[PDB]
RNA sequence: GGUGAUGGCCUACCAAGGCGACGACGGGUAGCCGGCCUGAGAGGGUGACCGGCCACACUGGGACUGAGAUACGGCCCAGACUCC
RNA sequence: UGUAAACCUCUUUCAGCACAGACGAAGCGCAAGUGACGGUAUGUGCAGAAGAAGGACCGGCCAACUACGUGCCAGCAGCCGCGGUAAUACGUAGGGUCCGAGCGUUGUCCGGAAUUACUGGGCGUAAAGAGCUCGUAGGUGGUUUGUCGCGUUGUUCGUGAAAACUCA
RNA sequence: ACGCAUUAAGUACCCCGCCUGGGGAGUACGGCCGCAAGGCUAAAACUCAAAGGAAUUGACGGGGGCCCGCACAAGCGGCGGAGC
């Protein structure tokens, strides 16, 4: 199930800017609530609680998926921490928020899941597919001559997109040479606090 | 830049004729988390005051952690007063594993990935003391040589001499680009 | 104790106590209540808590507490009682379900229905 | 009675070492001379000599010290004793202090450095921990 | 003597032995395992599904046929219960 | 409360309604047929945000607080304990936190418990040295030579069903 | 912690006895021994959220030591009796 709740409520309790352009962070940077201007006492717990919170709640996943991709990941030969944020940037919501074609990461979300893409010739409708090595994605007929994904494509002067992903035609085709490496996902917070919290 | 943390704030009174005078402690942990660690305990007659003095009493008792990276040398066990603390190194990305007193020295001495536990006396100074104590009795793979009278190769293990090497390089890397 | 005074005797467990008898291996059983009654609590507190003498289908005989501010139960009617610890009551050591069988949820609760087993509202 | 002979050894060390004596003195054995030769192998003492008294031969070992008073030997424990022995694979050979001690293994071949039995790909019963 | 087979398995005679604090004989409980859950590990608990063995077919005895029988939907007897 | 909403645009997964519609069958069969699942899965069309959120918790452990209502009453409670007209602990509100087709309670086991301590505890005063000896079984054993290879160690073969666990 | 400190409660090895929260309780039942008194072996239900050890600061003592104050002792004058 999604989260369908308001977005910069959640960046104002946590701190820190998720969607990134709002304007309603910078004109309330305080938590919400009656007593969000209450002094708040410290508390590792609430540290290490509030980085999952941005985690989860920058990425969409709900509390049992990032469990199990946690599992995953420590099971991983790597850092616990490198192995979540590559992992958790494997999904193809996220691929396609970073190459540009979503506006927003909710964006990308809806727009996979009404099957508006297609990995390798297959449609592919799930938002929690993880992008392997070597993936071709492509949009199909009926989705690229949309009005609003014409919108986006044509208007796409937004956020870089990075090395691993590439966008190569006009059809908004994307390409993926390889797994990010945590100099390449540079998303914002932190690893070690995320893996600290699930290991207590 | 000194990383300080708090562990216990304590109320503490003495009983007098008239009634019972109240003071503070606290004991305060100071470090600078490159390997220097310094523990303080200082108690006033309230709790901003009481801190200060325990800031600067560890600020005043210094000591220097052997570390190996980011992790530490060789698994140990301190004692002091009543408390046990057994301490294991950890492989890279770990992240510290340990209580709440014995996390807080741990991490203001700047170590990242290590298995701690606490094997009694629970209270929070005794378990303080005797992690100090276990860093103590920490030993350099150059001294044991050194103590030894043989050549680093036939004292270390080849994984601690590879993880030596790669310490060095990221040092080096670093300090390349911050000059220039 | 030395190695073979261990392959000698060896290390015996401590004998687990077991709680919440009257159950017998289950988690909630059907009584009947044999007494509706108040009883007051111990030193420090000082209250007026509403029990039940429960006979109960182990073939025991209980006395369970009854949660919420209104109980329609009257002596000898049809309950639920489920494991519960309460300070108060020095021998008490279970609960009755509220909103099972005979027992009704209580009325006017707006917070934590489910505990109480109150329906929602409208 | 004297059960252990080889924990005797030992303890006469730990004890010299910590009230900082030069040289210790004890009843002279095979087994005792071949501990000697490792410990002197590895740095832990300077020198060891066998020496003729009135019953038999005795060893005397020379303790090393630091140049700052630092002692050569942190600690000494026994490991297989009477009783409890213990024995170990070629594939389950103990480290100290992640490996930064040497822990003396009696082998088929002989007595060996933990290092050495790993190599030699033998193993035996561990004897005793040096760090 | 018996059995497919060795064997107090059974029988006649002869000898007086055999098992027991490394718990006989009793009492209580329980199908056993591959596995499952937990735990850093050792360990603790457990034997749901799936798989391998074992035991039983209302209770208690018995044999027959057969290569092979606790013979669930076979036989004989004695019981308790249901029906004509 | 809250960019939340109201409003302007937009895509409509999943359900709804239509048409098409399998693999499972290198199979059976000397017959012409042979799929129970099933007209399902699955495809292609139309309609429009339209048919779709709740549950615990908010003194400390333990992420998350103010007002009103009863004042040792009513009630709460996993432990310390909260209620004796100005309660962040009761009830209701707002607000918040945690999860989300689930959320809580009970029962049972493991963990935390180094609290049966082999790894890994103890016995002067906290629980704990028999009132003291002798001695049976048992456990344990000084220096050294030779032999055996039982313990120990190394290697190889067989076995350790499949499923399970872990890596690809 | 008090303290132990070559006569260890220090560093070590071997063997034995014992402990696993406070009550209930060294009690009940069973057994052995005893002339008896009784001893030895030795639980469970129920109940408490503690029972404890060492040391600290006060308070207290029909504990000690050193001091004072119309406190006593040495004196003067009263109140308690009467009317207001």
């Not at chain 1, 959640?10 to 009656?34: C, H, I």
């Not at chain 1, 099971?75 to 944020?85: C, H, I, M, S």
């Amino acid at each position: 199930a999604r989260y369908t709740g308001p977005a910069t409520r959640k960046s104002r309790r946590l701190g820190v800017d998720l969607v990134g352009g709002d304007q309603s962070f910078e004109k309330r940077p305080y938590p919400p609530g009656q007593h969000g201007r209450a002094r708040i006492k410290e508390s590792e717990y609430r540290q290490q609680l509030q980085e999952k919170q941005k985690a989860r709640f920058s990425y969409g996943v709900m509390e049992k998926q990032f469990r199990r991709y946690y599992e995953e990941a420590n099971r991983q030969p790597g850092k616990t921490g490198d192995n979540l944020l590559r992992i958790l940037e494997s999904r193809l919501d996220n691929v396609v928020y970073r190459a540009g074609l979503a506006r927003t990461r909710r964006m990308a979300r809806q727009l996979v899941s009404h099957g508006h893409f297609l990995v390798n010739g297959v449609k592919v409708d799930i938002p929690s597919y993880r992008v392997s090595q070597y993936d071709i994605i492509d949009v199909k007929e009926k989705s690229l001559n949309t009005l609003p994904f014409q919108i986006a494509r044509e208007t796409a002067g937004e956020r870089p997109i990075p090395s691993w992903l590439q966008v190569v035609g006009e059809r908004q085709r994307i390409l993926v040479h390889q797994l990010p490496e945590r100099a390449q996902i540079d998303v914002p917070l932190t690893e070690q606090l995320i893996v600290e919290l699930y290991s207590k | 830049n000194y990383i300080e943390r708090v562990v216990s704030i304590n109320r503490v009174s003495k009983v007098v004729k008239g009634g019972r005078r109240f003071s503070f402690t606290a004991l305060v942990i100071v470090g600078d988390g490159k390997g220097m660690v310094g523990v303080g305990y200082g108690k006033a007659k309230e709790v901003p005051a009481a801190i200060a003095k325990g800031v600067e009493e560890a600020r005043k008792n210094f000591f220097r952690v052997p570390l190996i990276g980011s992790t530490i040398t060789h698994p140990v066990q301190g004692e002091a007063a009543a408390g046990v603390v057994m301490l294991r190194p950890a492989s890279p990305g770990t992240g510290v594993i340990a209580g709440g007193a014995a996390r807080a020295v741990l991490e203001c001495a700047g170590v990242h990935d290590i298995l701690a536990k606490s094997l009694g006396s629970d209270n929070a100074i005794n378990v303080v003391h005797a992690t100090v104590a276990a860093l103590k009795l920490l030993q350099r793979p150059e001294e044991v040589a050194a103590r030894r009278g043989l050549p680093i190769e036939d004292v270390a293990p080849a994984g601690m001499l590879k993880a030596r090497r790669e310490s060095e390089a990221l040092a080096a890397a670093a300090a390349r680009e911050g000059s220039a | 104790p030395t190695i073979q005074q261990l392959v000698r005797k060896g290390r015996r467990d401590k004998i687990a106590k077991v709680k919440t008898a009257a159950l017998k291996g289950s988690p909630q059983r059907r009584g009947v209540c044999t007494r509706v009654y108040t009883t007051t609590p111990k030193k420090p507190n000082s209250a007026l808590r509403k029990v039940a003498r429960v006979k109960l289908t182990s073939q025991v005989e209980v006395t369970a507490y009854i949660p919420g501010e209104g109980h329609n139960l009257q002596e000898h009617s049809m309950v639920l009682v489920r494991g519960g610890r309460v300070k108060d009551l020095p021998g008490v050591r279970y609960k009755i379900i509220r909103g099972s069988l005979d027992t009704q949820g209580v009325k006017n609760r707006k917070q934590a229905r489910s505990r109480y087993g109150a329906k929602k509202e409208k | 009675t004297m059960t252990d002979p080889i924990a005797d050894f030992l303890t006469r060390l730990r004890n010299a070492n910590s009230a900082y004596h030069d040289e210790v003195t004890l009843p002279h054995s095979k087994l005792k001379a071949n501990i000697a030769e490792i410990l002197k192998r590895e740095g832990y003492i300077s020198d060891y000599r066998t020496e003729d008294a009135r019953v038999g031969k005795s060893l005397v070992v020379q303790l090393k010290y630091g140049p700052s008073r630092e002692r050569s030997i942190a600690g000494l424990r026994r490991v297989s004793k009477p009783g409890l022995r213990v024995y170990a694979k070629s594939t389950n050979l103990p480290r100290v202090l992640g490996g930064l001690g040497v822990a003396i293994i009696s082998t088929s071949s002989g007595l060996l450095t933990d290092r050495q039995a790993a190599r030699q790909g033998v193993g035996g019963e561990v004897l005793a921990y040096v760090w």
